[PDB]
């Protein structure tokens, strides 16, 4: 958990700066040790800070990486198998002609970013007034 972040921080931070399907797929394959909850957690933490820095442009992309991790973890958990063995199927169903899965992926993404914006405003308000 804590020792994981203080060991692959630079890797995780580099992971959130992606967005393509097969591109991030290989990134996860080459770094199968990155498919963890801490990873998704870090991306949130980072996104929230990015929003405060008014780097809303980068926040939009990092979220497209947070939802991927969350989805993979959920997908794998539902399958009741280790995520490290169930992380490529997500990228498979993204090409599937079933746009419902892709929409479901987008909906959470849009809502996630908006939820983040609220958190960031609460953070500054608690010290502003």
């Amino acid at each position: 958990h804590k020792t994981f972040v203080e060991k692959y921080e630079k890797q995780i931070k580099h992971f959130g700066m992606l967005r393509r399907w097969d591109d991030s797929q290989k990134y996860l394959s080459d770094n199968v040790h990155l498919v963890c909850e801490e990873t998704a957690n870090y991306l949130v933490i980072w996104c929230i800070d990015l929003e405060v820095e008014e780097k809303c442009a980068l926040m939009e992309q990092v979220a497209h990486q947070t939802i991927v991790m969350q989805f993979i973890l959920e997908l794998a958990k539902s399958l009741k198998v280790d995520p490290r063995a169930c992380f490529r199927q997500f990228f498979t169903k993204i090409k599937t002609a079933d746009r419902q899965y892709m929409e479901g992926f987008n909906d959470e993404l849009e809502a996630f970013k908006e939820r983040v914006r609220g958190r960031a405003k609460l953070r500054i308000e608690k010290a502003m007034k």
Binding site: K13, R19, D23, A57, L58, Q61
Partner: protein, 210 residues
Amino acid sequence: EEEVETFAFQAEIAQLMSLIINTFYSNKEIFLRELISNSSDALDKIRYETLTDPSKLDSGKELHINLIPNKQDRTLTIVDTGIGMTKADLINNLGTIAKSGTKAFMEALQAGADISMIGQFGVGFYSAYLVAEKVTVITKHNDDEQYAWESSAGGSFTVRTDTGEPMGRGTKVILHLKEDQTEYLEERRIKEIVKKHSQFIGYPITLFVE
């Protein structure tokens, strides 16, 4: 007289392009990966359309990417039998429409990114500027005519009606490689890059060396 219109590249696009052109990177062949990967997208896109409407196959039943180098003209042509883009697509997507990925990519570079993720943010097209000088793209969409999209860096692009031979359907991009970057006109060089990053393309790729 032809119909040539000059549009301006979006701020971030112009900035990023200036950076990509002035910054000396190492992994440059990424441009080929980006283009080829984007070419498969054009193919995958036309399929789904032809599945519902087979009438769009009269534009060419073939679906494959062709790589045509030219050591004489010093140009690297890439052709894909996808549905290509329309005049509106060319002007909108390539230049006008801002990409949140372009903005983030710049920030990512500051945060500590790499060039092998340029297409990750969706800016997987202007990477050709790392090796070329002037980009020329000709495409033939089904519900549209044939047009030519060319830009010689700076910060502006030119769109006009193509006069050249009918292409049927697909995207044809001719890269004006830099005089010092002819290495990509080598068959062994291209083949190496294809077997390197372009091995997951679910569409036949053919190199046409002279």
